Amino acid sequence: MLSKRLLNFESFEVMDILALAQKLESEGKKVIHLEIGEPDFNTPKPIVDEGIKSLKEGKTHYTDSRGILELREKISELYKDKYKADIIPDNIIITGGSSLGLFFALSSIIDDGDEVLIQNPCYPCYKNFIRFLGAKPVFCDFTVESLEEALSDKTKAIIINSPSNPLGEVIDREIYEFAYENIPYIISDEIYNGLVYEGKCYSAIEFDENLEKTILINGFSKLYAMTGWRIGYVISNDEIIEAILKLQQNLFISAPTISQYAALKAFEKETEREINSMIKEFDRRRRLVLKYVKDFGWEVNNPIGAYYVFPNIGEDGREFAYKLLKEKFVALTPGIGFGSKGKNYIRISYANSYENIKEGLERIKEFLN
Amino acid sequence: MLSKRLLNFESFEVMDILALAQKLESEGKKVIHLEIGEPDFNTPKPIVDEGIKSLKEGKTHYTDSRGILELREKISELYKDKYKADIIPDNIIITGGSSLGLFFALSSIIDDGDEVLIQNPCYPCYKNFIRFLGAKPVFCDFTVESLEEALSDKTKAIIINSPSNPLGEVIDREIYEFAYENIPYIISDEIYNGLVYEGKCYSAIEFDENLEKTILINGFSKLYAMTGWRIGYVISNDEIIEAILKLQQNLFISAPTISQYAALKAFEKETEREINSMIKEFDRRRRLVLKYVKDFGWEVNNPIGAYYVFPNIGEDGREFAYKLLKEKFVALTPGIGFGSKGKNYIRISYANSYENIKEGLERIKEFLN
């Protein structure tokens, strides 16, 4: 009865643990959550107040499907300042979150039979979007050699997520350079950009300033803690933006009105003040997690962004997770869920209060010894 | 370069007029808008205040992908009261608007090659969603005889929009009865339900109380004037709801948090008070429009819902629209856009202040004589 597409739609290997966590939590057992995929901070005050003010002024109808011009201008100015790339407001569309943006991007350029390159490990939703559109997801390490070996006549695009979920690492310059010379389309997922604790924020706009073959995806969910406000954006050339607009006009109409107006305050001095305070806290947490990981004898390799660490625990992450949860009440995400390469891995999210993370790590230390 | 899917995505035949309307509007000419597809009312006060309160309490993170339980319970109770149909909260999913809901519904049951029956005329987005999924849209009159002739071995579903956009009419009981005996799936679009001025509100839940073969789509955009809040919902049986959940978890995550909490106030005495006041005003407008239409010698047939009237002006709606706009500055929607059957038609929306509608109609009278 169900369609063929929905039959291929794989499920997240976290539903298991999530269920167990609620049971223990209902039994009155304090469960430490280190599997949270969203920041534990509230939305910055100036943004919240602007949302309140908008409601009082009746900003409740549909907006232009591209998104209010004022917002697109601010984002445009943002890119001309953070990077020396000049972008026109017409090259930007405000979407209902980063997830829809990505979906619309893939839809506009992928035909049945195409192959899309994605990193192993990567965001679990990528493969589902790709299959859904009749294309084939090609897993591969993001090294120059492996990318060369993965290329074919059907290779249509590559999805680069940097910093990445689950790794927490920043993709190197060479991967972008190789892709622009060899791959027809670069889809850059930069939703965690800004959440970088060492080095410089690397955007794809720096390699293809005319967005000739790149579709840039970003939003306000992570950097500004606006997950529930459902608002992101896509940037690309005229032909691609025009195509995404048609999809947007039919499937969604326009991003939530209150969020759009509220987001204007995200570029205020006071707000950037608050985000910098947030970035500092995340870094303090990241270091705490890295200290124990090295202590635990686990292997990682340069996690400097987002809020995840993906250690190689030398053993089955799936089983490790279950046992840890039942005995110490510590919720972790099994690595296998993000790719085959992650059987011996697990993802730790430090998007939880510092104290909770400490006790969480301490328990794990008591679990290993 | 663009994908095949986006190449088949037809455009709305309103972009023409819309452009012309902005030109005249910029020239300092007062244009009367009778092409508006959303209600001109603000969101009811109790809903707005609840949204303000939610923000002050930090309701800014993601919610369960099915939508907060409290909301689903209220909607569930709503159906048990307005209709004698009992529905469980698990049979409901809160979506980011009615458009996404419909898209997710079609995705879960349509395979490539399927044929979907849609009324001629109907909502322009239906055909685009259908093609996008590799199925074939089958236009037909919604009469028992024509539906029998349109059926085939590939007929997978039928989309019933009642009251309908563009007609403003309520679909009769027999069409539903025929569909449940002959068509595998009934997708009922009831987004305008409640906006009925004569008779009784007819829901599909009344013909298939167990939602064995129906997917019901409704939301808060029209009846409560929450278009920009982006929040609707889908109701169906377990297997279908479970499938739509997977799509929701990947493509959208969850409806905007502030809207969900704010919507709880839509079922308050004070709010229903305001919606009834709104319904009365719309009816006063509908009668004003019908008086002139009959005066104009135009033909309509029972428009008693939504806020549209689709008269047969005995001539090319497309051309009629252009001329009227340029001479009298009155924006109307050409009927041809909703289907081939509407060449000689045009859609008039009375989702504008009473006074504006009067002058608008008067101008048209001065255009005909």
Curated annotation (Swiss-Prot), chains A, B:
What are the UniProt keywords, alphabetically? Aminotransferase, Cytoplasm, Pyridoxal phosphate, Transferase
Q: Does the record's keyword annotation contain Cytoplasm?
A: yes
Enzyme Commission number: 2.6.1.108
- Enumerate the catalysed reactions: 4-(hydroxymethyl)-2-furancarboxaldehyde phosphate + L-alanine = [5-(aminomethyl)-3-furyl]methyl phosphate + pyruvate
The coenzyme or cofactor needed here is: pyridoxal 5'-phosphate
Where N6-(pyridoxal phosphate)lysine occurs along the chain? K222
Q: Which SUPFAM superfamilies match?
A: PLP-dependent transferases
Q: Which InterPro entries match?
A: Aminotransferase_I/II_large, AspAT/PAT-like, NHTrfase_class1_PyrdxlP-BS, PyrdxlP-dep_Trfase, PyrdxlP-dep_Trfase_major, PyrdxlP-dep_Trfase_small
Q: Name one GO biological process term.
A: biosynthetic process
UniProt-recorded Gene Ontology molecular function terms: pyridoxal phosphate binding; transaminase activity
Q: Name one GO cellular component term.
A: cytoplasm
Q: Where mainly located? A: cytoplasm
Give the EC class as a word. transferase
What the entry lists under Gene3D superfamilies is as follows:
Aspartate Aminotransferase, domain 1, Type I PLP-dependent aspartate aminotransferase-like (Major domain)
Pathway the protein takes part in: Cofactor biosynthesis; methanofuran biosynthesis
List locations, semicolon-separated: Cytoplasm
Asked if the keyword Cytoplasm belongs to this entry, the reply reads yes
Family the entry assigns: Belongs to the class-I pyridoxal-phosphate-dependent aminotransferase family.
Subunit structure of this entry? Homodimer.
Q: What does this protein do?
A: Catalyzes the transamination reaction between 4-(hydroxymethyl)-2-furancarboxaldehyde phosphate (4-HFC-P) and alanine to produce pyruvate and 5-(aminomethyl)-3-furanmethanol phosphate (F1-P), the precursor for the furan moiety in methanofuran.
The identity of this protein, by name, is (5-formylfuran-3-yl)methyl phosphate transaminase
